[PDB]
């Protein structure tokens, strides 16, 4: 009894400068079809010492009218393929305002490397796949 859906978030004018980027940016909401609204939450720069060289990615339950779900995050490169995918082993319990994710999703050093093609035209494209347990 699983409902699986996804959302592609393109972040424009990506910058490594906090005073320009903001410490926290969220995507617009999305769902499977569905009253449950979800959104992605990114910390361009990890908000703690252990994740300071990383970009943090979380899945947030915006509105809930109490829910368990698995998720997977991946970056879409310049040619549309999935890379640096990170998925939760199990499902986690979400309630309104609660998030789950990886504070060390990807190295801020990796994004800079143009060789990876992770920031085409200063655009970061993230793809999230959510599986809600019924």
């Amino acid at each position: 009894k699983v409902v699986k859906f996804s959302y592609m978030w393109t972040i424009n004018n990506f910058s490594f400068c906090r005073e320009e980027m903001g410490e926290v940016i969220k995507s617009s909401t999305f769902s499977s079809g569905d009253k449950l609204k979800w959104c992605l939450r990114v910390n361009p720069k990890g908000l703690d010492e252990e994740s300071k060289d990383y970009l943090s990615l979380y899945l947030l339950l915006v509105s809930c009218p109490e829910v368990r779900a698995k998720f997977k995050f991946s970056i879409l490169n310049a040619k549309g393929e999935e890379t640096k995918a990170m998925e939760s082993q199990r499902a986690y319990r979400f309630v309104q305002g609660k998030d789950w994710g990886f504070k060390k999703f990807i190295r801020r050093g990796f994004l800079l490397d143009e060789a990876n093609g992770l920031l085409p035209d200063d655009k970061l494209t993230l793809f999230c796949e959510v599986s809600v347990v019924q």
Partner: peptide, 9 residues
């Protein structure tokens, strides 16, 4: 990998 949350509980 193991997921984490920005909040406790």
């Amino acid at each position: 990998a193991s997921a984490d949350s920005t909040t406790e509980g």
